[PDB]
């Protein structure tokens, strides 16, 4: 019983390290997601204003 109490302690601490490990992994993944979302918000109004200038040349010339 002493051994198996220690073993249940061990399983509990393995769930602890699982919790912190997933915390760290997903927080770094959301950091990379923040970087690439900054990039996707960079790339939009440039495309739309180049479309506006497409309409410009498509009417005036």
């Amino acid at each position: 019983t002493i051994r198996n109490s220690e073993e249940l302690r061990g399983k509990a601490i393995e769930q602890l390290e699982k919790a912190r490990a997933r915390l760290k992994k997903v927080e770094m993944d959301a950091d990379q997601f923040r970087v690439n979302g900054y990039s996707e918000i960079e790339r939009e109004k440039m495309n739309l204003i180049n479309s506006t200038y497409k309409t410009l040349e498509q009417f005036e010339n």
Binding site: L48, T55, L56, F59, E60
Partner: protein, 53 residues
């Protein structure tokens, strides 16, 4: 949201600039036709003699 509003504004601007350029080309064309009407008075002078073979 920002691109929606600004692009509605941009396409509106593009179409109204199209209409302004259209008015300008219209007036320029009419002026050129009137100058051509003077030139073509000279043409009416110098054609009828040769038109008869």
């Amino acid at each position: 949201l920002e691109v929606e509003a600004k692009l509605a504004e941009g396409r509106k601007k593009i179409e109204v600039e199209l209409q302004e350029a259209l008015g300008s080309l219209e007036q320029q064309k009419e002026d050129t036709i009137k100058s051509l009407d003077s030139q073509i008075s000279a043409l009416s002078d110098d054609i009828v003699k040769k038109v008869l073979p």
